[PDB]
Amino acid sequence: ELLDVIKRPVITEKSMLAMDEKKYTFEVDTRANKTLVKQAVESAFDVKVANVNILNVRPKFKRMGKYAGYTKKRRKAIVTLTEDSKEIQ
Amino acid sequence: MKRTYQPNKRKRQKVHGFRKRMSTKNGRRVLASRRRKGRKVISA
Amino acid sequence: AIKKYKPTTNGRRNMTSSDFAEITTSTPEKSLLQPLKNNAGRNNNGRITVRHQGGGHKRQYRVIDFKRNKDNVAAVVKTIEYDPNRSANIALVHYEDGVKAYILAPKGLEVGMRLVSGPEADIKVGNALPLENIPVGTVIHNIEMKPGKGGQLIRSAGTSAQVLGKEGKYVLIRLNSGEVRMILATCRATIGSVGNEQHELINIGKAGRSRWMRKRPTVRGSVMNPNDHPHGGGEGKTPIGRKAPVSPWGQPAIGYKTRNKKAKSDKLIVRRRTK
RNA sequence: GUAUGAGUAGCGAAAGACAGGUGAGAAUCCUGUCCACCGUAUGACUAAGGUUUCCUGGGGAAGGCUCGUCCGCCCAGGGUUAGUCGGGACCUAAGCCGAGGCCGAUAGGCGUAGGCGAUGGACAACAGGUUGAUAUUCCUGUACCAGUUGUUUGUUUGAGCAAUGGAGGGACGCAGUAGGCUAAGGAAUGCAUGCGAUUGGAAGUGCAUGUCCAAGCAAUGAGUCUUGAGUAGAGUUAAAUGCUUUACUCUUUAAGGACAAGUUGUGACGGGGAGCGAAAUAGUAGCGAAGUUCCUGACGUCACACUGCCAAGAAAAGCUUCUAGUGAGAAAACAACUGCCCGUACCGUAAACCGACACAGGUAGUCGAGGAGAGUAUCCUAAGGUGAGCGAGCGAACUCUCGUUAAGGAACUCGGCAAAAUGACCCCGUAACUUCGGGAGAAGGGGUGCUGACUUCGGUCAGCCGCAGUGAAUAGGCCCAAGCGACUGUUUAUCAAAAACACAGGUCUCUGCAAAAUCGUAAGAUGAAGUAUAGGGGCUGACGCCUGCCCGGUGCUGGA
RNA sequence: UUGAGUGUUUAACCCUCUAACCCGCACCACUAAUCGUGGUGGGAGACAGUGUCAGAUGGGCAGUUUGACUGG
């Protein structure tokens, strides 16, 4: 559906270093492809993509007030470019 | 000194899991008796 | 011949074995083997229905021709081989069309003979014929009991039967064990006696070798407890404190007869002799 | 809920000491120096299992058998990247499920076609660098597999492609020695640096350290296995030029065919490398010498290759051919493009798994160095790891674990129980009895270090020293008689290991095959893809010599 | 369930037939099939198997019983 696929960017210290090699981190939808994410990114910014990489993240046990339960699941995709750039801030 | 419980992931699902309880007529007696009590886990 | 071992260990003292001198190769034909399993005496249900069986060496099944249906085409004998599934030896045979087959090896079969398998066949060892066409007094093996089904009767190592007489649609045979009988005159058999016959004289020698053959050990009824056997219990060694020693399931064990009294074959049996 | 026992038992194998940091506070946290422990493991890697325990910055109420500034604990943020690795889009074993079917008060039991199901088959990528935390996954260099686009002749079949059909193949046990290669190991050539402060040493013969490299591509190759052709016929459900086969003829150290560890080039003007070392917070960035010869040499690999034996050693797909075949015209050059889902942190001979515990127990597989040695034994060590989560004193009885003991030497006790004694290698010798194999390591005695000479070779002679030469550690006590069981084996998880069970051998009896016997209401099964030299049941129990009398009673069989 | 013919004796009995019933025999079709159903041969046959009733046998298995007084 190409506009519900990408959720938001990841902004951590390991992801700032990737922006200097032309790599961008997004939390994407669960039930999404390597190929589907690639299509969505090429559609929403007009770039050219080499190589999406993709991971799954486990939920974490948390415990606030004598009530415990897990956070969400997560999907993280890292998008490499040929030559162009996206400006997120 | 080997004790009785030796854990295994496949065996626990194959002997005690949802589909094994669904395939017999007495398994469904078990599942209904657990749903009638209010158990948060009705089948391993 | 029978081979005798020297007494170099206590497990060797009085053992004997086969020379394996009629066997000419040790590599079977590939297109005639199927798998087997070693049921070990267990049922459909997973239960032991026959005690004392299980767990020896692995075996592949050789397909035998017990029917002998290819007529008016000679077959040449190529090899005499070892079968793990029976006690007779076995022969690989080339028909001239180029069909291959295995066959039970009779006494005195040479590599090179050419066997024939119809009503106009000759009376030579190896040849198979319908019982109508076999004279009185020929030694015979591998006998059909129903037309077109396969030989069932005289099949183990060194056995034989004999033709006694003909009548309307039946032939009189004296089988191994000495029983006299009637068989339909349109059934088949092959001329000769079965082969490897010293087989009877082998002495197994130790308890491991009969474990290699798939046999598990046997406990006597009288060193059990009274809930396992009718012979179990008592203080000390005990005699058979009964009349007529019995099986684990009752049922006397010396001299008591167990065949069906309304057998549909009591018409055909002349002169029961040994059972 | 709270006492008594009572500030008592215990605080769960083991080596620390001091200086200096931090801090409200230090035997217990940090940094250093020396000392001590494991090293076929207490080192490195991994499959289960666990499930965030992993990294960074803070904290000290509870957990931690003491303490705590610390932590596998608590709070906040962050970490797991694949066309090629393991699993799916591939194959099948045991077993399981089973459209129709067959059986049965109900419920249901079984089973055909067809499927699921790895612990096995098949299957394309390597070496180095980089983070606080991932790497055959990121980066660098150089590859490979399957596709897609473009630029480089009659679907009859002599183009090409080709079966759910015919065939070949995949495709298999255990033991034993021999050979070849490579990893690993040892000793001396090259390097680089630097010369002893306690007597002595500038060194051909002196100390310390180091002493090399992939997949792919090309060339060849220690070696291993296998005879090959011609004609006349069978056959292979239709067809085959494919495959099987009978009869004849030539051929054999040969020829042909097939497979092969490794090596040498290239990859590589690259990488790594003893050390040297900053401009600041850095042993940091960055810059680097040399690549030898000889000895030993794998059960790792060639390869279950060769030999021998009996107990006679999976299946299916990928793969390769042949036609039948709906059937324009796809072969191969370059370029550039495409390639999905699941796992991937960390522990893993353990404080993270199974044992209620931070528990002297248990846990599949690969790697596993040196001296002396047959060795993965034994002692000490290398690479690596560790000092074990209560301490300081004193040096009573008693209990436990250890070492020594005059004279005697089983007088001890139910009983030599427990200790002590024997123990390695080489040589000499060695009884009765016996199933001729044994008994046998029978018993009983001698040698063993170091220097020199000769050494035919293996050793022998001359000399020297101590109480003692396998100078430590590791390693059979033996003999004469009698009972039971032939023997190797098995047994009361947790008071009984035996004379008990089993066993090879003996004998009696049942069973003619839809066998007897056993599971089941039945259907269906085992027996058995067996067929009386076979299968079931009872007793006895290697082997040697033998196995008396009784058929009245009771069972069994035959009778009329 | 279950039919048909001859003979031998005082109703019973020995037989012969083939169409029921049976086949863990062969070939054929449904068809990828050692199950099943149909078809044709062969074998066997009013026997066997199965239902109701009856007599034997039956520690294979089951439910129980096995007294009180008493210098214990």
Residue numbers in the entry:
A (entry chain U): 2 to 90
B (entry chain 4): 1 to 44
C (entry chain C): 2 to 276
Q: What does the article say, verbatim?
A:
Ribosomes are the ribonucleoprotein machines responsible for protein synthesis. Here, our goal was to investigate the structural conservation of the Enterococcus faecalis ribosome compared to Escherichia coli, a model organism for structure-based development of ribosome-targeting compounds. In the analysis of the E. faecalis 70S ribosome structure determined by cryo-electron microscopy (cryo-EM) to a global resolution of 2.8 Å, we find that structural differences are located predominantly in peripheral regions, while the organization of the functional centres and antibiotic binding sites remains conserved. The cryo-EM structure of E. faecalis 70S ribosome presented here revealed that the architecture of functional centres and subunit interfaces remain conserved when compared with E. coli and S. aureus.
We purified 70S ribosomes from E. faecalis strain OG1RF and analysed the complement of ribosomal proteins in the purified 70S sample by mass-spectrometry. Structure determination by cryo-EM using multi-body refinement produced molecular maps that reached 2.8 Å for the 50S subunit, 3.0 Å for the 30S body domain, and 3.2 Å for the 30S head domain by gold-standard Fourier shell correlation. These maps were used to generate models for the 30S head and body domain and the 50S subunit. The final model of the E. faecalis ribosome includes 97.6% and 94% of 16S and 23S rRNA nucleotides. Ribosomal proteins that are less tightly bound and those in the L1 and L7/L12 stalks were not included in the model. The overall structure is similar to other bacterial ribosomes, as expected, and ribosome functional centres are well conserved. Motions described by eigenvector 1 of multi-body refinement include an 11-degree rotation of the 30S body with respect to the 50S subunit, and a 7.5-degree rotation of the 30S head with respect to the 30S body. Motions described by eigenvector 2 include a stationary 30S body and 23-degree rotation of the 30S head with respect to the 30S body. Motions described by eigenvector 3 include 3-degree rotations of the 30S body with respect to the 50S subunit, and 22-degree rotations of the 30S head with respect to the 30S body. Inspection of the amplitudes along eigenvector 1 suggests that the motions along this eigenvector are likely discrete, whereas motions along eigenvectors 2 and 3 are likely to be continuous.
